[PDB]
Amino acid sequence: STGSATTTPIDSLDDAYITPVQIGTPAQTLNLDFDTGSSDLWVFSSETTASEVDGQTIYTPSKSTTAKLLSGATWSISYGDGSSSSGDVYTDTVSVGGLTVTGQAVESAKKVSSSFTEDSTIDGLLGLAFSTLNTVSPTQQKTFFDNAKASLDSPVFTADLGYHAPGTYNFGFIDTTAYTGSITYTAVSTKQGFWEWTSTGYAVGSGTFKSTSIDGIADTGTTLLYLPATVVSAYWAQVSGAKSSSSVGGYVFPCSATLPSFTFGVGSARIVIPGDYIDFGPISTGSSSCFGGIQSSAGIGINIFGDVALKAAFVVFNGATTPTLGFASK
């Protein structure tokens, strides 16, 4: 089997991407944030505290003939940006882009943090990291990908995120029309539950390439590119007037700037992030100070190849017995 679904930016900045997901019988379609940095499929639901729902579409298990309470199971998750959610668990039929999993754990939110409530466009998350990170207790549950894997034509999914445009998540096949040149594959460590890999270095603009190992995670659920402070300083030093602002929470730059590109290494291959991808617009409405898309990972504890990086590539998440990651230009 295979699946193919379009993923669409939630706003003009590509702050995140939503993908329609069919849950239950008859289908209830919710728009989920596919997140290769976590491993819980959770949804706004009929059980979510009413004051914490503001415009989201909810899953109502009582209206699904295939929903079953997973008795005794609870979940609770905290994300890198400080947001959180928790609740109980149902199993139900879940389909993404024509690919159907029966008995998928659907984690029903009883509580969500303000960040989630305030984003009316995201109805929940669909985790695509390794199932060892799944938070369901006392019986850990598998991700949608892990459940689908054996049925897939090939044990892979791909992320093809758009810049200010829709893109695609495919399951079970590599669309050879969706990228240019060849795909370069690189080793993955699953020790921390993430799609963790080592970039071979970077360049700023038309500058020379610096060969240096940068360990980090491929994380579709993180907006920006978080890298070591040395690398980030070298980038922003090429933008007149750019500075790190403790009050804003990162590097800002004059909105009048033309940003240089940023290149990262994948083995001997190179992925180029155009400068425009690094612009996240005014820090507040009407400001001439703009927020940068490359930020320091210092104090996160991990480097994160978020959407800013990933949307510059066609990315293969290879879930073979020994997982790997592939990157191609597009």
Side-chain angles (χ1 to χ4, degrees), residues 1-62 64-67 69-109 112-141 143-148 150-190 192-242 244-330:
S1 61
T2 63
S4 184
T6 297
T7 193
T8 300
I10 65 165
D11 61 25
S12 66
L13 301 178
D14 298 346
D15 279 315
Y17 299 78
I18 51 173
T19 309
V21 174
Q22 282 70 50
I23 311 177
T25 308
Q28 299 181 38
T29 299
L30 274 65
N31 296 327
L32 304 188
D33 185 351
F34 282 23
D35 180 16
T36 62
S38 68
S39 304
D40 287 50
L41 193 175
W42 76 260
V43 299
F44 277 79
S45 73
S46 55
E47 301 181 331
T48 311
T49 301
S51 61
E52 297 184 344
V53 184
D54 188 3
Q56 295 81 10
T57 296
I58 63 164
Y59 168 60
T60 304
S62 69
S64 174
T65 58
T66 42
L69 179 72
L70 188 61
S71 182
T74 59
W75 62 279
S76 179
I77 193 161
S78 299
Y79 297 100
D81 68 354
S83 68
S84 65
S85 52
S86 63
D88 54 20
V89 187
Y90 292 84
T91 55
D92 208 340
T93 303
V94 173
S95 302
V96 174
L99 169 64
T100 299
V101 167
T102 57
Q104 174 63 46
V106 176
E107 302 174 32
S108 171
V112 302
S113 64
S114 58
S115 179
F116 288 115
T117 299
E118 290 163 1
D119 189 355
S120 65
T121 71
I122 292 178
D123 300 325
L125 266 66
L126 190 151
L128 293 166
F130 291 90
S131 293
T132 53
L133 295 180
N134 175 265
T135 76
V136 177
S137 180
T139 309
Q140 191 170 59
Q141 300 295 304
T143 69
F144 174 82
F145 179 53
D146 215 338
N147 281 325
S151 301
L152 294 180
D153 292 357
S154 179
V156 305
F157 68 91
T158 67
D160 181 9
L161 303 180
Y163 168 65
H164 295 349
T168 306
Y169 283 101
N170 290 330
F171 291 86
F173 73 105
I174 288 159
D175 179 357
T176 59
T177 70
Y179 59 87
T180 61
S182 54
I183 306 177
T184 298
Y185 290 86
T186 195
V188 163
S189 171
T190 63
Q192 290 191 95
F194 299 121
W195 293 91
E196 186 170 0
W197 64 290
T198 302
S199 172
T200 48
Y202 71 99
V204 177
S206 61
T208 58
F209 187 85
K210 176 72 167 182
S211 295
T212 184
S213 294
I214 304 170
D215 242 80
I217 67 168
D219 186 359
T220 58
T222 292
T223 312
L224 306 185
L225 173 53
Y226 294 88
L227 293 173
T230 47
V231 177
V232 177
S233 184
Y235 179 81
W236 289 110
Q238 297 305 310
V239 179
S240 181
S244 181
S245 170
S246 157
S247 60
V248 176
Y251 280 90
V252 296
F253 67 93
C255 292
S256 61
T258 297
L259 297 177
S261 62
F262 183 88
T263 300
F264 64 92
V266 182
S268 55
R270 306 289 181 254
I271 300 295
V272 180
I273 308 171
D276 292 341
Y277 289 26
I278 298 161
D279 175 22
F280 279 75
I283 59 169
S284 294
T285 306
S287 178
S288 68
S289 178
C290 274
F291 198 66
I294 294 176
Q295 296 293 345
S296 178
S297 65
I300 297 179
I302 196 154
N303 300 307
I304 308 176
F305 292 89
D307 297 334
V308 164
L310 303 181
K311 77 179 80 171
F314 176 87
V315 189
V316 181
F317 294 79
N318 171 26
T321 302
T322 296
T324 63
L325 273 172
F327 293 82
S329 294
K330 66 187 184 188

